[PDB]
RNA sequence: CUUGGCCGUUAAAUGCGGUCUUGCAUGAAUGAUGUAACGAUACAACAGCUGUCUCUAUGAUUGACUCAGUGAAAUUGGAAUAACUGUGCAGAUACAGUUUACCUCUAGUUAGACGAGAAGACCCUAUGCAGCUUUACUGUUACUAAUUAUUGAAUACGAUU
RNA sequence: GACAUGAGUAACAAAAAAGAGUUUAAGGUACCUAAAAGGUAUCUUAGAGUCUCGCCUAAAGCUUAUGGCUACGUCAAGUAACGGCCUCUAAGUUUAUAAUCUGAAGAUUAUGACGAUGAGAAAACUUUGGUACCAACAUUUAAAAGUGAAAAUUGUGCAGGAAGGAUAAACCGUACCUAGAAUCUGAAACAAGUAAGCUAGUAGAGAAUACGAAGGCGUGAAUGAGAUAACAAUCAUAAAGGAACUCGGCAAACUAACUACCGUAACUUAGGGAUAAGGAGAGCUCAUUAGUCUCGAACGAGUAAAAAGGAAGAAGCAUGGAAUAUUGUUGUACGACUGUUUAAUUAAAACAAAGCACUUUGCAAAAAGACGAUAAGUCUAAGUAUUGAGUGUGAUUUCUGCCCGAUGCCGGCUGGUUAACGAAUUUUC
RNA sequence: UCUUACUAUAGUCAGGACUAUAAAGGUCCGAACGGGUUAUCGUUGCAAAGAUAUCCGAAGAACUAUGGUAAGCGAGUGAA
RNA sequence: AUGUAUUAAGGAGAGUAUAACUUAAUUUAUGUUUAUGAUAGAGGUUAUCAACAUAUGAACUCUUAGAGAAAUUACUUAAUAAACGAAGUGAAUUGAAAUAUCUUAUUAACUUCAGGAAAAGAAAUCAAACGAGAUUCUAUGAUUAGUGUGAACGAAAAUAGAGCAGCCUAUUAAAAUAAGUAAAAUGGCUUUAAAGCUGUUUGAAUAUUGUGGGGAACCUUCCUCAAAGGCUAAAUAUAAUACAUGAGUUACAGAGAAAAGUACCGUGAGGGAAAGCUUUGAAAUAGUAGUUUU
């Protein structure tokens, strides 16, 4: 069972609580099973990985810019 | 402790004999030696039917539009016990 | 059985100290001593043991008839191998037949008034020393059970039978207790012949404070050492008694002869009351 | 001054001394709940 | 009273130790008195030892100081905030008179700003409090005594007469 | 509530400590080049690593707890190589039942239930009471020796040392942090505080002292680089003198540990004082060797064996060589003594104490004492006058004198007084 | 959940020395541990009780852990 | 804030189409009117382009079987907050310029029991020589009578209004008309000394053909009522919800809460925030510019 971090009801506001835990089960198969390997970044165009990657960098840089403001700093 | 102490206590926070289940159900009884005897009359099975040749899928073509049923004059249209009994005589009278 | 719990510290069922200066002693076990001795027949003393919750010693006896073992307050001089017997449940058929009569006071005392034998006080002759004297006809021993203590039979309510043989006429007999009080006791009350063992108990010396702590005794703080709020004797600059007559923490006179026995509770069994020293020095 | 009185504090004593069942099962504990419930508290115990 | 008299200790003794007594105001389980042992108790002396001192000096590290980075606090009526003598709610940067001083900082220093802080400390006041004491006033209890009721009798003796 | 002043000041100093290379990602500048790009160098932010040096080291290391505002892919039938849940019970708890007590609330006793800080079969495969017991202390025991546990054996001392039950694999925990370098408590990234096991080696009696193998660290710029004034802190040394300082030898210095070494006073409760005091010795090389051990063949040889060993010898200013153990003696007061106390200004002469003494307690239903809006009832105590309680004194030697008037307590008159009660009386309308 | 006392279940005390004991001592020297004698520093402190040195106890009236009980008309606990 | 109407057990945890609420978290049907409503198309996720009325599937865990460290275990078609009501118990601050009686005060608070309300209630009541005619709520009567040294406390008759209801054959099932009772002494409560309540010890009578209670010490006559047995709606109290009104508030106001009993503080009981919008931009304060002085 994997627990979940305690959080507030509405993010930065609300009472403190804890979501329901997660349960994982590992079964010992009688017959082996091997997963396929993930496609290369150049072969994910069926999922629009190009557009998705741009939006991801914008979000990673936005949380990174907010983490600098949380330290009481600003980008010169 | 200041604030984490005021959170709901969980089994991953203490170990001095604190046990709290996940509502998985009772599958047997405890012994006096510290073991567990599984009562297979309480264990549950999953009745899954053979899906070989089954043609129905969880989706219906959108060309066929969604139209609700109509039972004019009857307030208990779909739940009418008389409609279920009267229709029973027509189709299957034996059982 | 073990002697544990908060009662060892001087607490009652409420959890508050009702007996001061108690707690922290050594772990102990209570011994189930037989203070009634109803079962008849000979009993072989197996060994004299030491009892921590008692000043006198106890004797592990064994009933030769059934083999059951029991504890009894050992007498002064009682050693392993001695055969004690209790004639409280009646005399055996052999002893009665040997006399051939209902009873003979002289013959009986010669065959039953032996050290460690438990008899009704009526059967014990006058002037004999006893150390397990009871009060009621069917009660346990209550007097002179401490180390070195004993009681003497002063008189017996009897009359001459025209043949020089006295016979009990009343229902009680007088006995002088360890405190010097000559009171009245039941005719059928039990008594053990002899003296309680460990006569040199009161001559012991502990030598150090730590030994008293092992005996479950905690320090005793004087009243003069306290403040005016914790004791009628507290207060004052320096050593001062405050011109206050000695009393307890709750106002009970600690000296002068004040008796704590309830007045309405009059002792109807006393023939001669105790002698009051009245504060005069003994030695 | 204040003292570090919560040093070595175990969460087993919190449940025993300030827990929910220490109150529903006592006359004076039912008041605390009813009092805290009338005020609108979410944390009725511990 | 008093640094009591004498003796010993110091070159020098209001101390310390011994001793004598008239002890303002020692004293026998609010114990009296004398030793062994014990003491981070208190006092005094000796030997040794030393920068404790005569009398300080040099050396070491970290701060102090400068540059770069980050960045407080108590405090503050407002200030263009010198010296003297005088004056005055009686101790003047601020009034009177005279004198002196180009403008502005840095490191030191703490004489003053009756410096700051703490209603800290003392005394007094209140028909303000608290705790404690007692032969304060007024009360309640433990406890003691008598007695109706629960509860009916017999005999003897003594006392009033 | 906002914004000033102090002030761009103090502070970022646990006496561990840093130095020089290298490299990854993203981004900012300069040049190359103007086909965009790319390349070279540099800077910023977030990291990683190599060589050297140092600090901790019975920790500032590793493995785990209590705990957690650190983060959620942490995986078990059981043993070796695991806890919980579950069974049993202790101290206790109980709006459970019955009885009893009680202004209500409630309390008491019994039984039941619950309650670990304890007890729970088997496994490298598994499912009666000394004929005793498993508190402390000591001893012995898995046969090559030694050491550390486990369990057991034997014995000692008094302070006399639990309870109960038995005897084909569910559910829950498993991540990280352990306080000198990012996590627990101290308001916090605090020089404080917190449990268990392990915790290289040399050297030792040792967990003392010194060094330190591995490991970790030498903080999130919460800092870094210079300079080395006064003054402060923490230290080091010192001519001659040696308490002349000062309320006072405060602080500092001297001394110090070790040996089966020598020697040791007054006084004493005969135990002590006493490790008194005061002296001697110490490392390195070596002659010498009864046995043990080794080697060769009784004997011979050997310290590339442990030890023993002497008035032997060498070198230096010095061989308790560095570090670790802070003087000795004497006269008094007070308190016998070991202990205890105002957490966080008084550790003491105060408290306690063994001892001593006095008062109280006869247990026949309540021993007294204490507790109980107040009782039943509980502790005392499964005790009995050598018991329990209260009061003062405070080991021991030598002693503890006079006064019962006052005060308190105790005993006592068919006494005096004497409320209620009450013989005999009396009044308003 | 601090602290005082009691209670139940448990745990800890290197090494050495003296004494009648192999083990019988509120014995001795001294770590861990527990105390807090003296001095300095600190005092808007690292710390609303700390640091360094020095000193005391260290088989006991010892120390420590997890639970439990007793406190607010009357006073719980108190080597006071 | 008040008024009016309706109603008569409240919260939490976790989860989910983030207007949609319970693992079915946007169920399935009926009737009517649909722009002269109500108050001749497109659109099923590019959704819910329809309101009213009447039915309907589902609706988890804890509070809440027993246990336990609430949201767990183990079982099972186990289940009810606060405020208000009545009785019992019952203070102190305070005032009297101290302070004891007194006042504060039949108060606060606590305990028990009970319902949507409860309690009370159809005269052993008041009046005064005339008469009224149960209870409850509001006002006057009334800083009155009166008590008390004082300080202060403080009725009733009656009147007005809100409601109006009487009965025992109680519109829900009750009496053979009430004896250890009325009453007395004594110890208290209440209070004006009466009446009423009460522990202890004692202890009556039988109806207007004048028996019993009361009419404020008490006796007497007269008047009035008929205890020791009972039932009864409404006006009233509290809470929730909806609506109406406003010389009520408009963000340090209103409420503690315009996202709140949340965040946060405390071991705990408990304490308890800040925070609106797209408009306007005052002072203080800071760095500069112009003129001017130094
Ligand atoms: K100055
Ligand atoms: K600085
Ligand atoms: K060490
Ligand atoms: K398991
Ligand atoms: K009660
Ligand atoms: K540390
Ligand atoms: K010194
Ligand atoms: K202490
Ligand atoms: K004394
Ligand atoms: K006298
Ligand atoms: K006298
Ligand atoms: K006399
Ligand atoms: K020592
Ligand atoms: K007055
Ligand atoms: K008046
Ligand atoms: K009636
Ligand atoms: K402005
Ligand atoms: Mg954890
Ligand atoms: Mg944990
Ligand atoms: Mg358990
Ligand atoms: Mg005592
Ligand atoms: Mg004593
Ligand atoms: Mg004492
Ligand atoms: Mg005192
Ligand atoms: Mg007193
Ligand atoms: Mg005096
Ligand atoms: Mg405090
Ligand atoms: Mg603790
Ligand atoms: Mg005396
Ligand atoms: Mg700077
Ligand atoms: Mg002047
Ligand atoms: Mg001027
Ligand atoms: Mg200065
Ligand atoms: Mg001025
Ligand atoms: Mg400055
Ligand atoms: Mg400076
Ligand atoms: Mg670049
Ligand atoms: Mg059990
Ligand atoms: Mg356990
Ligand atoms: Mg912290
Ligand atoms: Mg720290
Ligand atoms: Mg570390
Ligand atoms: Mg560094
Ligand atoms: Mg010198
Ligand atoms: Mg010299
Ligand atoms: Mg001098
Ligand atoms: Mg001088
Ligand atoms: Mg030489
Ligand atoms: Mg002493
Ligand atoms: Mg001492
Ligand atoms: Mg102190
Ligand atoms: Mg001190
Ligand atoms: Mg003595
Ligand atoms: Mg008694
Ligand atoms: Mg004395
Ligand atoms: Mg009379
Ligand atoms: Mg010792
Ligand atoms: Mg300073
Ligand atoms: Mg010592
Ligand atoms: Mg349930
Ligand atoms: Mg339940
Ligand atoms: Mg009125
Ligand atoms: Mg009637
Ligand atoms: Mg009456
Ligand atoms: Mg009358
Ligand atoms: Mg009356
Ligand atoms: Mg009447
Ligand atoms: Mg009248
Ligand atoms: Mg507001
Ligand atoms: Mg506005």
The neighbouring-strand residues paired with C174 are C155, C184
Whether residue C119 contacts residue C193, with contact meaning beta carbons closer than 8 Å, is answered with yes
Q: How far is CA B37 from CA B40, B43, B44, C226, in A?
A: 9, 12, 15, 66
Whether residue C272 contacts residue C182, with contact meaning beta carbons closer than 8 Å, is answered with yes
Residues from B in contact with A at Cβ < 8 Å: 3-4, 6-8, 10, 12, 22
User: A6 touching B, CB under 8 A?
Assistant: yes
Give the phi and the psi of residue C109 in degrees, each rounded to 5. Answer: -60, -30
Distance from chain centroid for Cα D37: 13
Gap from CA of D5 to ligand 51 centroid (Å): 20
Whether residue C139 contacts residue C132, with contact meaning beta carbons closer than 8 Å, is answered with no
Residue labelled with tokens 């209902």 = C102
Burial code of A8-20, b = ≥16 C-beta within 10 A, e = fewer? eeeeeeeeeeeee
Give the number of other CB atoms < 10 A from CB of residue D33: 15
Q: Cα–Cα distance between B15 and C202 in angstroms, integer?
A: 55
Q: How far is CA B76 from CA A29, B57, B66, B67, B71, in A?
A: 52, 30, 21, 19, 8
Q: Cα–Cα distance between C42 and C123 in angstroms, integer?
A: 18
Whether residue B65 contacts residue B54, with contact meaning beta carbons closer than 8 Å, is answered with no
Best probe of the B interface among A21, A22, A24, A25, by most B CBs < 10 A, is: A21
Whether residue C258 contacts residue C249, with contact meaning beta carbons closer than 8 Å, is answered with no
The vertex-C161 CA angle with C159 and C162, nearest 5°, equals 120
Best probe of the B interface among A7, A9, A15, A16, by most B CBs < 10 A, is: A16
B10: Cβ–Cβ under 8 A, 6 or more apart, which residues? A3, A18, B20
Helix, strand, or coil here: C124? Answer: coil
The neighbouring-strand residues paired with C3 are C28
Q: Cα–Cα distance between C234 and C242 in angstroms, integer?
A: 8
Gap from CA of C264 to ligand 56 centroid (Å): 29
C148: Cβ–Cβ under 8 A, 6 or more apart, which residues? C56, C76, C195, C196, C198, C199, C200, C201, C202
**DSSP character for C76?**
T
Gap from CA of C47 to ligand 34 centroid (Å): 100
Chains B and C touch (3+ CB pairs under 8 A): no
Whether residue C119 contacts residue C173, with contact meaning beta carbons closer than 8 Å, is answered with no
C-alpha torsion sign, points B50, B51, B52, B54: positive
Closest chain D C-alpha to B12 CA, distance in angstroms: 12
Whether residue C144 contacts residue C194, with contact meaning beta carbons closer than 8 Å, is answered with no
Residue ranges of the alpha helices (H) in chain C? Answer: 93-99, 105-112, 209-214
Ramachandran region, residue B47 (left: φ > 0; alpha: ψ -120 to 50; beta: rest): beta
C-alpha torsion sign, points D22, D28, D34, D36: negative
Give the phi and the psi of residue D21 in degrees, each rounded to 5. Answer: -75, -25
Q: Cα–Cα distance between A59 and A52 in angstroms, integer?
A: 11
What Å value separates CA C79 and C1' F280? 63
Question: What resolution in angstroms, rounded to 1 decimal?
Answer: 3.0
**From residues 1-46 of D, which are strand G contacts by CB within 7 A?**
1-3, 5-14, 16-18
The neighbouring-strand residues paired with C45 are C61
Q: Cα–Cα distance between C156 and C122 in angstroms, integer?
A: 7
**DSSP character for C33?**
B
Q: How large is the C-alpha radius of gyration of chain B?
A: 27
Which residue in chain B is spatially nearest to A19 when comparing CA positions? B8
Residue labelled with tokens 């009171």 = C183
Q: Which of C139, C138, C168, C163 is nearest to C153 (CA)?
A: C168
Give the number of other CB atoms < 10 A from CB of residue C56: 24
> What tokens does C262 get?
């309830």
Burial class of residue C149 in the structure, from the number of CB atoms within 10 Å of its CB (0-12 exposed, 13-18 middle, 19+ buried): buried
The two beta strands, C133-134 and C83-85, are unpaired
> What tokens does A61 get?
């840089």
Ramachandran region, residue A41 (left: φ > 0; alpha: ψ -120 to 50; beta: rest): alpha
Beta strand residue intervals within C50-111, DSSP E: 58-63, 69-73, 83-85
Say yes or no: Cβ of D13 under 7 A from any atom of strand H: no
Give the phi and the psi of residue A53 in degrees, each rounded to 5. Answer: -65, -40
Q: Which of C116, C82, C111 is nearest to C97 (CA)?
A: C111
Distance from chain centroid for Cα C45: 21
Helix (H) or strand (E) holding A59: helix A49-70
- The tally of CA atoms less than 13 A away on the side-chain side of residue C64 is 11
- Determination technique used: cryo-EM
Q: Cα–Cα distance between C49 and C71 in angstroms, integer?
A: 9
**DSSP character for C193?**
B
User: D9 touching B, CB under 8 A?
Assistant: yes
Helix, strand, or coil here: B10? Answer: coil
- Taking the C1' atom of every nucleotide in all shown strands and the CA of D25, the nearest one is F95
Q: How far is CA C258 from CA C121, C223, C251, C278, in A?
A: 34, 19, 12, 10
């Amino acid at each position: 069972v994997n627990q979940r971090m305690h959080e507030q009801r509405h993010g930065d506001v609300g009472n403190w609580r804890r979501p329901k835990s997660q349960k994982m089960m590992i079964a010992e198969l009688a017959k082996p099973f091997v997963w396929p390997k993930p496609p290369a970044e150049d072969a994910r165009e069926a999922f629009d990985y190009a557009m998705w990657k741009k939006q991801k960098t914008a979000q990673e840089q936005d949380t990174k810019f907010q983490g600098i403001r949380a330290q009481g700093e600003v980008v010169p | 402790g200041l604030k984490y102490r005021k959170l709901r206590l969980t089994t991953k926070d203490v170990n001095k004999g604190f046990y709290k289940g996940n509502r998985t159900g009772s599958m047997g009884t405890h012994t006096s030696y510290g073991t567990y005897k599984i009562d297979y009359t309480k264990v549950r099975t999953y009745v899954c039917p053979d899906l070989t040749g089954f043609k129905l899928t969880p989706f219906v073509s959108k060309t066929i539009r969604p139209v609700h049923d109509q039972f004019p004059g009857d307030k208990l249209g779909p739940k009418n016990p008389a409609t279920y009994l009267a229709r029973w005589k027509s189709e299957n009278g034996l059982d | 059985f073990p002697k544990k719990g908060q009662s060892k510290g001087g607490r009652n069922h409420s959890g508050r100290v009702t007996v001061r200066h108690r707690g922290g002693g050594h772990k102990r076990r209570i011994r189930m001593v037989d203070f009634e001795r109803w079962i008849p027949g000979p009993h072989t003393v197996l060994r004299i043991e030491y009892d921590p919750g008692r000043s006198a010693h106890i004797a592990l006896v064994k009933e030769e008839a059934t083999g059951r073992k029991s504890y009894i307050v050992a007498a002064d001089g009682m050693r392993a191998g001695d055969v004690v017997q209790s004639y409280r449940s009646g005399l055996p058929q052999d002893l009665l037949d040997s006399m051939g009569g209902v009873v003979d006071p002289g013959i009986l005392a010669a065959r039953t008034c032996w050290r460690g034998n438990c008899l009704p006080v009526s059967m014990i002759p006058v002037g004999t020393q006893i150390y397990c004297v009871g009060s009621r006809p069917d009660g346990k021993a209550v007097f002179c059970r401490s180390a070195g203590t004993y009681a003497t039979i002063i008189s017996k309510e009897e009359e001459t039978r025209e043949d020089g043989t006295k016979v009990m006429t009343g229902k009680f007999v007088n006995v002088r207790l360890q405190s010097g009080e000559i009171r009245r006791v039941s005719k059928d009350a039990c008594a053990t012949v002899g003296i309680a063992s460990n006569i040199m108990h009161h001559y012991r010396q502990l030598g150090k404070a730590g030994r008293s702590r092992w005996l479950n005794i905690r320090p005793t703080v004087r009243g003069l050492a306290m403040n005016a709020n914790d004791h009628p004797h507290g207060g004052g600059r320096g050593k001062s008694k405050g011109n206050r007559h000695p009393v307890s923490p709750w106002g009970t006179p600690a000296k002068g002869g004040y008796k704590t026995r309830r007045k309405s509770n009059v002792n109807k069994w006393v023939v001669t009351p105790r002698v009051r020293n009245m504060g005069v020095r003994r030695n | 001054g204040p003292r570090p009185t919560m040093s070595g504090a175990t969460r087993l004593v919190q449940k025993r001394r300030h827990g929910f069942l220490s109150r529903v099962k006592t006359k004076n504990g039912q008041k605390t709940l009813k009092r805290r419930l009338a005020k609108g508290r979410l944390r009725l115990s511990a």
